[PDB]
Design a protein around this ligand. Structure first.
Ligand SMILES: OC[C@H]1O[C@@H](O)[C@H](O)[C@@H](O)[C@H]1O
Length: 140
């Protein structure tokens, strides 16, 4: 297994689609599912703040975050300030994780029920059993 460790850098792979969380090279802002090609924009440095994880783009130094109120369909975006996440192991595949906005029922969701199309947005969605809401955190 791969330990998630503060100060280490990982790729984050959708269990259903097999694409990774990718900071779009089109705008350096939008967070999308894209096939892994060892891009620095596909690599995220994890830091434990004492209470939560922050995920920093290896390419841009922006953090993985959101803007405005968590809801179904809230887009993930690059943000300037560290944004705190909580991770919980999944029930269907216990080597995988669900990644939540703290104190909410909203977790990362690869949109369109895990569409494999490159560029598919990564968003928040209310937690439910679909495997497109589950992610492995892997060595780059
Ligand atoms: O169109 C989006 C794509 O842009 C490319 O430049 C980048 O290498 C990919 O990882 C992906 O972000």
């Amino acid at each position: 297994s791969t330990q998630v460790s503060s100060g280490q850098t990982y790729k984050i792979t959708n269990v259903k689609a097999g694409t990774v969380i990718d900071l779009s090279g089109e705008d350096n802002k939008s967070i999308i599912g894209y096939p892994y090609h060892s891009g620095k924009n596909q690599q995220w440095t994890f830091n434990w703040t004492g209470k939560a994880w922050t995920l920093r783009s290896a390419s841009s130094g922006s953090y993985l975050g959101i803007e405005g109120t968590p809801a179904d369909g809230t887009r993930l975006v690059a943000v300037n300030d560290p944004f705190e996440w909580h991770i919980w192991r999944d029930e269907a595949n216990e080597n995988a994780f669900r990644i939540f906005v703290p104190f909410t029922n909203y977790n990362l969701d690869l949109s369109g029920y895990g569409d494999t199309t490159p560029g598919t947005p990564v968003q928040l969605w209310w937690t439910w059993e679909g495997l497109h809401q589950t992610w492995t955190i892997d060595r780059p």
